[PDB]
Paper text:
Menin has been identified as an essential oncogenic co-factor of MLL1 fusion proteins found in acute leukemia patients. Importantly, recent clinical studies found emerging resistance to Revumenib treatment and patient relapse as a result of somatic mutations in MEN1, leading to point mutations of T349M, M327I/V, and G331R/D. Understanding how these mutations affect menin structure as well as the interaction with MLL1 and current menin inhibitors will be crucial in the development of a new generation of inhibitors maintaining their activity against menin mutants.
On the contrary, mutations of G331 to arginine or aspartate perturb the charge in the MLL1 binding site on menin, resulting in decreased MBM1 binding affinity. However, analysis of the crystal structures reveals no clear rationale for such a loss in the MBM1 binding affinity to meninG331D. This analysis suggests that the electrostatic potential in menin is optimized to match the charge of the MBM1 motif in MLL1, and an introduction of either positive or negative charge distorts the charge complementarity between menin and MBM1, leading to a decrease in the binding affinity. However, reduced binding for G331 menin mutants was not observed for the longer MLL14-43 and MLL1160 constructs. This indicates that the presence of the second motif, MBM2, compensates for the partial loss of the MBM1 affinity towards G331 mutants. A similar effect was observed for the competition with MLL146.
Residue numbers in the entry:
A (entry chain A): 2 to 53, 74 to 386, 399 to 460, 549 to 588
B (entry chain B): 6 to 15
The structure:
């Protein structure tokens, strides 16, 4: 497998030597996913998992990396006989992709915690026989590249990974598990999930990677965590530098989440002469609008979290409103629980905490407060409108009474005189999409909000207590 | 623990 030109940079003695390797591979016809994932996993093992003995950087010797490479390629070539699966015309078959998926799956440790850190790379697969969910999909794509199957590529939503292949790259196959206690669907298409308009499959507006984007995925998959309180500065630096390399070559253009990740790293440690974090967050949103029909949630969540961290209440509320405007056109389905948890935490923890602090600061005489800005009240209302509209037509409900007390409290953080300025109109001015918010319009301007009436309108509950 | 690569937040 390893060609002479792939070996000339070893040993890798620094962050910068690893970046040089990535640069060299990204300059080749096709970057070697197996080589690159092994190198990252090796470096991550000795910078985050076991730093005993570390003095600067874990030197990656060719003999060591080549031996791991050979273990991988021997395992895949011996287990997958290509003669059994004839390939017409640069196109792999569903049976072949399933075989490769089975070889990876069947190699894993019988029992292990699937939620651990540092089990994403081919280094983990070879040395520990352990992979996380998305790691299995990446490993299938790396195995397929090692086999010469140029048409097999990684597909990514915001919470899941699978593969595309076949004539025109138009076929889809599940190759790993999703979540905890869901039933395998390995071998099947993603068409039911697309048709049901779940967030998990993005209404079909998911990422179809080329090889360079598969390199970007492995970079985003670097985990600098040493423990709950400490990150590896070395791995943060490596991730940041590799992301800029990919950015400069054009390979983040269609990868919103990578752009957000890069923006986050720039906020932590700015690189002189590069774009500000805000510019990068906006670029991520633009990517989602340009390539994915503005059907992604996380570009707006990335932006909102940045404003939240910086206590920009107005801009945080606007970005969460924008978040909800995306989700409103989805149906909440069985395996979408991660995005429900995110909306729940924003509505019922994050926004309440932000508004509580804003209330204290207003008491102390703050000027230009979000709490005195009717446009901010309108953003709060748009946030809840999008969540209510999301619920419409969904097979599983979203709202319940455990949301209602937080809604009443948040509404109440704006005085009646501020709330009155927003004009709610039918199809500061706001239009509601959801039937639940339309029915609540009446209640939104009283000096003291009617808590019980709000609760009734937000929830399926239609009666009050009997006695 | 484990988070999906490049998901926002902590």
């Amino acid at each position: 497998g390893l060609k002479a030109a792939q070996k000339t940079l070893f040993p890798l003695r620094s962050i910068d030597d690893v970046v040089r390797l990535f640069a060299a591979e990204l300059g080749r016809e096709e970057p070697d996913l197996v080589l690159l994932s092994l190198v990252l996993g090796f470096v991550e093992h000795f910078l985050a998992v076991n730093r005993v003995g570390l003095t600067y950087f874990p030197v990656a010797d060719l003999s060591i990396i080549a031996a791991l490479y050979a273990r991988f390629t021997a395992q895949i070539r011996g287990a997958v006989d290509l003669s059994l699966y004839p390939r017409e015309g640069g196109v792999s078959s569903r049976e072949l992709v399933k075989k490769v998926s089975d070889v990876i799956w069947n190699s894993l440790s019988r029992s292990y915690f699937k939620d651990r850190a540092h089990i994403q790379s081919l280094f983990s697969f070879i040395t520990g026989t352990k992979l996380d969910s998305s790691g299995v999909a990446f490993a299938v794509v790396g195995a397929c590249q090692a086999l010469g199957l140029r048409d097999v590529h990684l597909a990514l939503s915001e919470d899941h990974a699978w593969v595309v292949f076949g004539p025109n790259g138009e076929q889809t196959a599940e190759v790993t598990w999703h979540g905890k206690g869901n039933e395998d669907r390995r071998g099947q298409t993603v068409n039911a999930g697309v048709a049901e308009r779940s967030w998990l499959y993005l209404k079909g507006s998911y990422m179809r990677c080329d090889r360079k984007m598969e390199v970007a995925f492995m970079v985003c998959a670097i985990n600098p965590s040493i423990d709950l309180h400490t990150d590896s500065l070395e791995l943060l630096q490596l991730q940041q530098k590799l992301l800029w390399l990919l950015y400069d070559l054009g390979h983040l253009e269609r990868y919103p989440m990578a752009l957000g990740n890069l923006a986050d790293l720039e906020e932590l440690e700015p690189t002189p002469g590069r774009p500000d974090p805000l510019t990068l967050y906006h670029k991520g949103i633009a990517s989602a609008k340009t390539y994915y029909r503005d059907e992604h949630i996380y570009p707006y969540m990335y932006l909102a979290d940045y404003h939240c961290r910086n206590r920009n209440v107005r801009e945080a509320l606007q970005a969460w409103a924008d978040t909800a405007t995306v989700i409103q056109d989805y149906n909440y389905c069985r395996e979408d629980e991660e995005i429900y948890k995110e909306f729940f935490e924003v509505a019922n923890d994050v926004i309440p905490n932000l508004l509580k602090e804003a209330a204290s600061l207003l008491e102390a005489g703050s000027q230009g407060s979000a709490l005195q800005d009717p446009e901010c009240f309108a953003h709060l209302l748009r946030f809840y409108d999008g969540i209510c509209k999301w619920e419409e037509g969904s097979p599983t409900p979203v709202l319940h009474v455990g949301w209602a007390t937080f809604l009443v409290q948040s509404l109440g953080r704006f005085e009646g005189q501020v709330r009155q300025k927003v004009r709610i109109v039918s199809v500061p001015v706001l239009t509601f999409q959801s039937e639940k918010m339309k029915g609540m319009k009446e209640l939104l301007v009283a000096t003291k909000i009617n808590s019980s009436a709000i609760k009734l309108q937000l929830t399926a509950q239609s009666q009050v207590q009997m006695k | 623990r484990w988070r999906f690569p490049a998901r926002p937040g902590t």
